[PDB]
Structure formats: C-alpha cells, structure tokens
C-alpha cells in the first residue's frame, strides 16, 4: 500500500460511509454466492443448508466485524501491515491454511458492496486508490505461506 493523504483520505474516509457494524457480514455472505465452493473452511459455520441460512447465521454478523475489522486496522496503521497481519497470516496459514487464490476475490466483492450502497462515491480516483491498498492484505495473509 502507498497513497497520498489526498487519495487515501477518500478510500479511508469511506469507512464512515460504510456501516462496518454489519456491512462486514454481508461481504462474506456474498463471497459464498459468487464462490460457494469454499465450503471446506466455512464448514464451521455449520448452518449452511441454503444460501439464506448464511445470512440467518448469528456468527456471520459478528464474524463480519472481524474480517472488515482487520482491514480498518491497516488504514489505522499502514506503517506496517505484516506487523499486525503477523497473527492473521500465521493463524490463517497453519490454523486455517486458506489457499492464496481467494483474497483477490474478497477484495473485488467488498468494493461491489460500496459501489452499490454508495455508487455516488465510486469516483474513478476512489477506486484505483482502493486496490493497491487492500492488495497488501491479500499478500500479508500469504507472506507466511512461502
């Protein structure tokens, strides 16, 4: 990650516009629809009889604040991602061992949740300055893999 306080203050200010209070739970419930084959790791959620059983799950709501939360932690300290993502990566590498070909997706899904609930802000400069930012997380949770 590496942007100027001007282009970063926008993708960073969108945090308020985003109700992380739950928007983090809808981001995962969607990643499953566009990619439900990941039923190997989400096997813990148990409740998964039908796509609707996911949004009805109580953990997905609280678990959403954890996923979208780790992201807000970076914007709150981009001084070093691998520094804080040292546990998530180690916990996601040896504990969950999530294939590295997945984060690149959760990044294209969340963005869609913003352009939809906030399309009046998907300005060109706000998007380009949105990939290289979270793009560091995709690798952060993969820097401990190799």
């Amino acid at each position: 990650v590496h942007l100027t306080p001007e282009e970063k203050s926008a993708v960073t200010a969108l945090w308020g516009k985003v109700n992380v209070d739950e928007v983090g739970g809808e981001a995962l419930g969607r990643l499953l629809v566009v990619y439900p084959w990941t039923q190997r790791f989400f096997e813990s959620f148990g409740d998964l009889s039908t796509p609707d059983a996911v949004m009805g799950n109580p953990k997905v709501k609280a678990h959403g604040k954890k996923v979208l939360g780790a992201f807000s932690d970076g914007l709150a300290h981009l001084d070093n991602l691998k520094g804080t993502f040292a546990t998530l990566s180690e916990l996601h590498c040896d504990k969950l061992h999530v294939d590295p070909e997945n984060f690149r997706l959760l990044g294209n899904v969340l963005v869609c949740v913003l352009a939809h609930h906030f399309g009046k802000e998907f300005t060109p400069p706000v998007q380009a300055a949105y990939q290289k930012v979270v793009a560091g997380v995709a690798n952060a949770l993969a820097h401990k893999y190799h």
């Binding site: 566009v34 949004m55 963005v111 998907f122 998007q127 990939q131």
Partner: protein, 141 residues
C-alpha cells in the same frame, strides 16, 4: 452449456437492464481501465479515456454478446467462436484481464442495479461467464 436456473437469474437481470445493457457494458470498461496499471503499456488502441466513441462502442459488444448468448446459450460456442479467434488467434491478448472485466460489471452496474440482492444473482453474471469464458477460449477438441 448451462441450463439450470442459473439463466433465470441472468434473463431476469437482463430484464431490468433492457435498452440499458449496451450502456452498463461501456461503464464496465472504464471500470478497470481507470486504474490502467498494466494495460497502460499494452495500449489497447482505442483511447481508454473519455472523448473516445470507441470505448462506448466496445461496451455494446459485451452486452450484445450476453444477449446473443441468451439468444441461444445452447449453441453460442459457434457464434461467439470468432471472439475466441480474435483474442486467441490474434492480438495475443492476455485473458488475465477476464478477472477484471468480470467484476467490473458488478462494480459498474452498482451505480444502478448490480446483483439485485438475490442469494444467486451475484453468481449468475459471475458464473454465467463460465459459458462466455469457455467459448472465448474453446480448446477446440
């Protein structure tokens, strides 16, 4: 290829789109091009910037394929066989962008009507591309 309700979600999304498909198809281009990170050195040859009737002329080609595809989706691999010949037997383009234009439709239509909030639509335009992506690079048995 395809057959289950996977289409009912596509024909549905195509119902709200209607005479507005060739439009969202153009906004899907400026979606990934705006970042113009790698393609910048590739120079697609059509001014990805505004003031380029060529960019809007390309979108209609994407929304026209999905329609011409929904028009058959049971024999489109032959009609869309040319696209695979232009992207595979010409331009040597790198399909690696398919992952970009694929999500672009979801981020570009967002400014209007993206998935629709159906536990399946999000996968409709994302997976239905499986039949459009396979015909775009048919291995030709």
């Amino acid at each position: 290829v395809l057959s289950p309700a996977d289409k009912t979600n596509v024909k549905a999304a195509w119902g709200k789109v209607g005479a507005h498909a060739g439009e969202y198809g153009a906004e899907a281009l400026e979606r990934m091009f705006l970042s113009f990170p790698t393609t910048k050195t590739y120079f697609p040859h059509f001014d990805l910037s505004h003031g380029s009737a060529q960019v809007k002329g390309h979108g209609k080609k994407v929304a026209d394929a999905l329609t011409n595809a929904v028009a058959h989706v049971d024999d489109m691999p032959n009609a869309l066989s040319a696209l695979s010949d232009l992207h595979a037997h010409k331009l040597r383009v790198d399909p690696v962008n398919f992952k970009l234009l694929s999500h672009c439709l979801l981020v570009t239509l967002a400014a209007h009507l993206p998935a629709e909030f159906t536990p399946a639509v999000h996968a409709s335009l994302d997976k239905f591309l499986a039949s459009v992506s396979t015909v775009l690079t048919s291995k030709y048995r």
